[PDB]
Amino acid sequence: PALTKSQTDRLEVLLNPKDEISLNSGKPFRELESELLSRRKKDLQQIYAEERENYLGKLEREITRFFVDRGFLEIKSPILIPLEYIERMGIDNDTELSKQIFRVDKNFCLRPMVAPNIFNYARKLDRALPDPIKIFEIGPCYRKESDGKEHLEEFTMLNFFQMGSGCTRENLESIITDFLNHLGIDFKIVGDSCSVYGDTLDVMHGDLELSSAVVGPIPLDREWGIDKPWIGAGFGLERLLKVKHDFKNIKRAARSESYYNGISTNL
Template sequence: MERKPLDSLISKNGLWVSRNGRLHGIKSCEASHKNLRITMDCGEVVKVRNSRSSRAARSLRNRKFQKPCKRCRVPEEKIKEFSRKISKNEVKVSVRTVPSSQFNSYENKIPDMALPSENTLHEPVKPVQASTPAVSAKQTQKQTKTAAAKTFVPQPRTKKPKVKKSGNHSFQKPAKASKPQFTQSQKNRILSLLGPGEMISFSKEKRSFAELESVLSTERKKDIRQMYEDSRENLLGKLERTITEFFVDMGFLEVKSPILIPFEYMERMGVGEDKKLSEQIFRVGDNMCLRPMLAPGLYNHLRKFDNVLPDPVRIFEIGPCYRKESDGSSHLEEFTMLNFCQMGSRCTREELEFIIDEFLNFLDIDYEIVADSCMVYGETMDVMHKNLELSSAVVGPIPMDMDWGVDKPWIGAGFGLERLLKVKHDFKNIKRAARSESYYNGICTTL
């Protein structure tokens, strides 16, 4: 007999056998990556792993139970049908993954989802019949040659008059001095030497590449010496210290999670090897990877601090992440993330927007919030500065929380520190704000 997973058996029978042998009717069944949450007709709720060899799977497969649950009121015909060796019933329960847009708390009921209608009727295409008999290719070519021979009339050739060129060049205008032409590599070099806020028009520039490079290099040397005299603080490190002070004062606990994590964590986040997003992950060996996000570490800390710290639990982390997405002026393969999270009471959209507003006003950055969605979290709130996304924020719970042992409401948001620096200092390219050997505080160091 084929050993079907637990969700398939539930979908087939529409019944559940508890540990004490009671046979229950199933009201709804919700699935995440590895777990199931089953609500009985009597109101009892259980959470189990979607296993092929569990006690529940064996009971449903072998159709063994002691007696039906009185409160579920399972119909007698359904009990007799379940007791038979081969069931002929159709699917009784639809097991589905619940999107976060319809999932506000684990105790809420999940509304029924209507199946889309399928239009399977198509008009057959009738072949078009030719009204005249087909003519062979040889016969057509023969008729064409005969017609051409009758209509062709040779024409006499005419000579074109020769135009004599004047040998006197005394009236030609002298050539103007040409403007300096810049190759693409020269343009890139000049752009890298520009300071924050500086601009240049290559079409109007009169200086040669060598002159322009020399002037800009001299200016950048002065800027670096001035930074050394003024502060000697790296902008990225300074921003990280400033953000840490802000969130500690807000009552958040700072945590530090490993950068090298098991790839199984990404599977729990819904980014398995069969997903397109998995191509962005830097793999290390067969089972490990560099973290592309801070969420796995925050999930583990929330679970461990629950019932230890006072309600609500508030934590944050700032650290490096890695993704294979370096194209464009707003993406990096190595970048720094801030993630803050609150679990327990007051986990509402209003509270999340209040924290974001306090944080960005503290940094003096204008923003707006727009609705969006993503593969991992479902519905999100994107924090935008003009056309640049600064953050993606979420109001939980969401279905994947089960796989992390988290069963309380939560709110959270993630910000890219390099993008915050790009906005604050008007950097044209995010690489000026990143960990780099080519730039220091947005100033080119290749001089």
């Protein structure tokens, strides 16, 4: 007989993009499941025997090497930041994004973005380092979400930032272009609106936003003690993984107990 929706959901959990198994077949659920379980077990065994690296960790290392080689300083700043920093990004209690914030005490929250820390490092380092100032951070960010198709509550952001000389739209696009061609991820850059900062570039993979990027200066800068030209962009690592490995849902690329490198751990 026909597969139930529940059964199809179960098989899809075990389906990988690589597979070429037709669900319109002359075989019962039990055999389709057993076959997929066997394949997925073999996938994990191959990883265990050979590379043993997590995709999210490996991607971070690859991105890190890319930016370190291009002259960007690697930053590791607090994940737990003051709620005040979020107000200073121009996000009042009444506004929309403030509901998305995971608060910890009355004082602190889980960073929804690394910008505050990047701006602070830029300002401080400008007193020590030659122009231009080039920095990047990769790490966890957190936002309460209703969507679970392209949106995680716990995700990993790459943010790079340059300040001083060379901070042009052209150079921003070149870094982005070299970065994504290096990772082997297809994209197009479009100039669209996003009132978290102002006018932006959007880096799209079809209908999926990989990044929102900014060419400063912007009026917010003075709140962070920045008074120089700057360029910057943020990318979600899980989105890059989702695109690179052709995962149907972003949860397959996330920190998870249910998936390892996009392979179900519920076998």
